[PDB]
Amino acid sequence: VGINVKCKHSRQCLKPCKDAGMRFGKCTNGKCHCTPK
Incomplete structure (x- = not known):
């Protein structure tokens, strides 16, 4: 779930x-996390 990017x-x-x-x-x-609507 989400993406694989630094922050x-x-x-x-x-x-x-x-x-x-x-x-x-x-x-x-230590990473970018996102979730669906």
Whole structure:
């Protein structure tokens, strides 16, 4: 579930999550995490 991209805070993961077509986006486990609507 989600994508496989690095992150530095949290808001920087919303960019690739929203552009990938997912709804949620946050930095977790040192990586970008997204989930469906």
